[PDB]
Paper text:
To elucidate the oligomer states and the interaction mode of OsCyc1, we determined the cryo-EM structure of OsCyc1 and finally solved three OsCyc1 structures in dimer, tetramer and hexamer forms, at a resolution of 7.9 Å, 3.5 Å and 3.7 Å, respectively. The dimer is composed of protomer A and protomer B, and the dimerization interface involves their α domains. The interactions in the dimer assembly of protomers/chains A and B occur symmetrically in α domain helices α22, α23, α24 and α25. Residues S674 and E677 are both located in the original dimer interface and form hydrogen bonds. The S674A/E677A mutant form exhibited the highest relative enzyme activity, comparable to that of WT, and showed a lagging peak position in the size exclusion chromatograph, indicating that S674A/E677A is present in a state of lower oligomerization.
Numbering used by the authors:
A (entry chain A), B (entry chain B): 80 to 767
């Protein structure tokens, strides 16, 4: 059980500097490097070995878990083109020529989206240097020249002088780039001395000029890789934040807050006032990882500011590439949909404009079948937008969305797309599913007996002639609003308390709807506290705030204001006692903040109930739509002070407030024949 | 200066059991008592001495400060009728007969209201026993038989058997009551054994049957009075509560809270579940003193409940007499106007019904000249209603009303009315005016230099290009809202703080009206805290709540809610620091109560501003009138929790909240050409 925990604990404590599926095509592009100091043949033989003893029994080259010839052709011939330059091991040269010479024909029947990074740029250059060698391939295919045609298209639309001004993907893909003057190509290089983190871009003229200032990049990625090499490295930021994101989406990272805070610290001290990149020192910035990092850094309590994201505004448009206008994919903006929800009054309206832009911009691929990514395959991203569009953060239960993601994690079944087909292993690891499944299932097993015991305690308590028609459809939802809110095992005291403290108030409120209200009171309710379980301080401190609640009941009996805020503060003061939650108020900001907090609580809770019945009839559109926006435009400040670390307050007590306000915000914008199947979907039918 | 303080301190520490102006008419009514144990003549000679050596040089009898023959005739002849029964001192018998025999003619030219307590009942009985004696008076006056006529009227309308069931004024006035069976007249007697606290009612047949169970009353009021005696005694409750009421109306009792709490304790332990009377054990209850005591006991923090006042409802009517329907006077209901304002949600609607009844019921004598009392003369009671009707407790500055009462206290110039003309000395004492005048005048002298210094500090602070047109008409009212709110000398720190902390917020709010709001901010205001005076903690704790205020400024910039509550809590947190006001929050009810308190603060402060501009135009009647009632119907709960002692909170901090909410409630319902002359009236022109 804890075996998986130890495995991932070591894996994250050993967070390294790169873990990529080893490529085979770039390996030859560097294997052509002559010996630097007047040698005889190749520079490294071990890569050549890894080349020979890593061919599929059928003779193909690439990944075995998937079949995609459009890339398999490059992977299967570029390995051979080196054994022609060095005349070694004629066994598998012609053993693979039998494959390629008869199976290089299915170019024009792949697909219309799955084109590689300049697949029309290097493939010619590949066959271009292969032309001089002893090659004999089926040159005459109409599918190939139909690709040469776009090569000549793209080699002209690119600039000449200004092309020496962008560090961009054209500098990432230099194989199909001939006659490149090197006078300016040296100053715009990677901070550690690489060519866009790729060695093939070096090996254009690196073949004889061994500039160490770029050669330690290569020799490092050779000697410590020990057999084969991918094309792009390092990616520390890329892999790191991508891990923690999905892991927080798993809901089991709580055991690893230490290493969490460590990688957050790395990214934090690695922040630039102009953007972010795949790695630590790359000055080529984009929008997507910058946004998701700005999001997650804030989400775990760090001092963030998004005004830099104004570097993508093209007459209202936005794109991933910097100053470059190419059709973005679904996720590089979907992340921004996720990241735009948590506005603060100090923020800039760019997030809003971007939100209304991207919302409709994705509403195209809402119903249409264009839900696919441009640079990766996915299991169910429509499943992700299915939740993202109809559920904001203000009603985003952090457990039902995990219940949804259990059908969205593929792992081995999905291969990521780069310059070549490759996977990761670090966070694309295949026991995260096993661990999250087991964790959620034991959670399931505990709530199954908790609701059982609550049922017995309830119908043995004569609380049925108080309330109303059907107690089952109320006990289940009441237990849900708590269990789906607080799921840990070490707070079952609060878990059982919230249920009963809501049930009692619900019963008496339903009684006051019946006999009319506080003036027609016939019995003394103050003693109903007795039959909740007994403790040392859980009982008296309970009854006193309970009498405060009844005080309010009597207080408004000739008014028009609702009862939301009082029962809300009832529940939170109940939790404060149900957790032994106390504080050194030796500092005046303590009450300063606690005051405004429970103030906003009643404020929003009463401002929503005026929409409750007005929507139960719908007597006006402008009014209801104004109520909702007025709710959220200060729900922001609520979340803000709940989720800013500048305070000296305990985190847990700051956040349990948001817990219940979110519970009620959810039950507000979900109708019963919407919420009904949610309990089934969560608890009833188990995984595995 | 403190001489008056010592005088009244002794006077109140020596709060006794009765202090009434000594009568002269009842003295003879008991002087006719024969010697009990077989004596010769009268029972006590010293009263007879006090009779002879207390005649005016002109020969009249009564008070010298006022002239009212309708009673002076009784006082001047009843003293003589005894010297006829005992044949002593023929000097002043005939020396007063020269007066009476020629001056007993002005009966029919007194007035139409100033009739004594059954003046038509005893005057006949007086001349009735005088008939048998050697008298020779001008019997033939048509004004006298015109009074005999109503005597025969009233002696028949009274019942026979049920007249033995009410302890009432008919039992108080027994002189004109002949042939009274004594079998039931003994069980309904005063608890100490008196006849409605009057000895003449005994001396009807007490002349020979010396029942000690009623005779110790007489002998006590003889031996320890030592010369003369009034008719009604004891009145401990009557005089006591009447004192503390007017003294609290003086605003100098603060030096005497000890004796205050002592008399409050006496009245408190002297409460009955059925009503109150003049004295401790009298079972004859009324409405007026019961109501004013229920008021003042609550006002100083004691556990009260008014449901008993349902014993006056006569088909909607109310009256002072119990089951008796006689036209009440102005004050016995005016007190209830004063007492009905401070409703609580737990209260009964009797106060409301009574309020709408008595409001219009007095609106008759609002303009009409019928503003006079039935049992007392007054200096200016129209001055009292002049304030009571147009100013509720919710806008009742406790210093402007004292400024008004300085012209309402007459003291010696006014004689109270009972069965005979008499005054008090205890609380109708003539240095209370001197003390209150001196106290208010030194208050005046201190604020005169305080505003002077504030003016210098302000125009030296460059706060003029912020704000608006005329700074004088704002500095004066700002200083007023504080000085008229807090007047003591030992809190000048808070006094000077409130002024500047309101001025700064006012200036920046007026700036935000100008440039549009928080989004068009051009400078950093957070540093404006520096130029208020510097201290150890008065500065930082100030700036932080100040930044909280600015936080709210930014928070609502796209909303429709007002700014009242935030600046209100600003001012109160400023006072909390300007008084070193701190608390042991080791108890959860501390924040429980402080939270709801500042919640109601913002609630009411924002619910009033929506009426502010809507009244500046008046675009609807029902809406504005609903806003005001909705304000007060929870202003009640505000005042309630502010003014209930069931809490463990400090009183001062509970009440400073009410202070400012009242300041703004006043400035709301007073228009500038109403408030303008108030500052003049208070401070500009001094007393003396």
């Amino acid at each position: 059980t804890t075996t998986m925990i130890d495995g991932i604990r070591t894996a994250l404590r050993s967070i390294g500097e790169g873990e990529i599926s080893i490529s085979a095509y770039d390996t030859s592009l560097v294997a052509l490097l002559k010996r630097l100091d007047g040698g005889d043949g190749p520079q490294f033989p071990s890569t050549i070995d890894w080349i020979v003893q890593n061919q599929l029994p059928d003779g193909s080259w690439g990944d075995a878990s998937f079949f995609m010839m459009g890339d398999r052709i490059m992977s299967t011939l570029a390995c051979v083109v080196a054994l022609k330059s060095w005349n070694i091991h004629t066994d598998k040269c012609e053993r693979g020529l039998l494959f390629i010479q008869e199976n290089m024909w299915r170019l024009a029947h792949e697909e219309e989206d799955w084109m590689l990074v300049g697949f029309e740029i290097a493939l010619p250059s590949l066959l271009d240097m292969a032309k001089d060698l002893d090659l004999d391939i089926p040159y005459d295919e109409p599918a190939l020249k139909a690709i040469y045609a776009e090569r000549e298209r793209k080699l002209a639309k690119i600039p000449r002088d200004v092309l020496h001004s962008m560090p961009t993907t054209l500098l990432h893909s230099l194989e199909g780039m001939v006659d490149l003057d090197w006078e300016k190509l040296l100053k715009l290089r990677c901070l550690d001395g690489s060519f866009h983190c790729s060695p093939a871009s070096t090996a254009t003229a690196f073949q004889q000029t061994g500039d160490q200032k770029c050669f330690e990049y290569l020799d490092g990625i050779v000697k410590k890789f020990n057999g084969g090499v991918p094309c792009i490295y390092p990616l520390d930021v890329y892999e790191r934040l991508w891990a923690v994101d999905r892991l927080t989406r798993l809901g089991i990272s709580r055991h690893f807050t230490s290493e969490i805070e460590d990688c957050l610290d790395y990214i934090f001290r690695n922040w630039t006032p102009d953007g972010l990149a795949h790695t630590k020192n790359c000055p080529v910035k984009d929008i997507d990882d910058t946004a998701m990092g700005f999001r997650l850094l804030r989400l775990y309590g760090y001092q963030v500011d998004p005004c830099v994201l104004k570097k993508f505004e093209k007459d209202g448009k936005f794109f991933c590439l910097h100053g470059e206008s190419n059709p973005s994919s679904v996720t590089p903006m979907y992340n921004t949909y996720r990241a735009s929800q948590l506005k603060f009054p100090g923020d800039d309206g760019v997030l809003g404009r971007a939100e209304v832009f991207c919302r409709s911009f994705l509403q195209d691929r809402r119903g249409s079948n264009r839900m696919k990514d441009k640079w990766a395959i996915a299991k169910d991203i429509p499943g992700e937008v299915e939740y993202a569009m109809d559920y904001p953060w203000k009603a985003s239960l952090p457990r039902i969305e995990t219940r949804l993601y259990l059908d969205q994690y593929g792992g081995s079944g999905d291969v990521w797309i780069g310059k070549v087909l490759h996977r990761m292993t670090l966070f694309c690891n295949d026991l995260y599913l096993k661990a999250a499944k087991a964790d959620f299932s034991n959670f399931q097993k505990e709530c199954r007996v908790e609701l059982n015991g609550l049922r017995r305690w309830y119908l043995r308590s004569n609380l049925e002639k108080f309330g109303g028609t059907d107690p089952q459809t109320t006990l289940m939802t009441s237990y849900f609003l708590a269990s789906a809110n607080i799921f840990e095992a070490n707070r079952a005291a609060e878990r059982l308390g919230w249920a009963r403290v809501a049930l009692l108030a619900d019963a008496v409120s339903s009684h006051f709807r019946r006999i009319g209200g506080p003036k027609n009171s016939t019995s003394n309710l103050e003693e109903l506290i007795s039959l909740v379980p007994f403790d040392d301080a859980y009982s008296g401190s309970l009854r006193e705030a309970w009498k405060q609640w009844l005080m309010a009941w009597t207080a408004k009996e000739s008014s028009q204001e609702s009862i939301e805020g009082d029962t809300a503060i009832l529940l939170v003061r109940a939790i404060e006692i149900f957790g032994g939650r106390h504080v050194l108020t030796g500092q005046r900001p303590d009450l300063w903040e606690y005051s405004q907090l429970e103030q906003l609580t009643s404020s929003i809770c009463c401002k929503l109930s005026r929409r409750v019945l007005a929507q139960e009839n719908g007597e006006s559109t402008e009014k209801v739509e104004e109520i909702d926006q007025q709710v959220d435009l200060e729900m922001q400040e609520l979340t803000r002070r709940v989720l800013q670390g500048c305070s000296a307050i305990n985190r847990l007590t700051r956040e349990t407030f948001l817990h219940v306000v979110k519970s009620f915000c959810y039950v507000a914008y979900c109708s019963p024949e919407t919420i009904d199947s949610h309990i089934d979907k969560v608890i009833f039918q188990d995984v595995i």
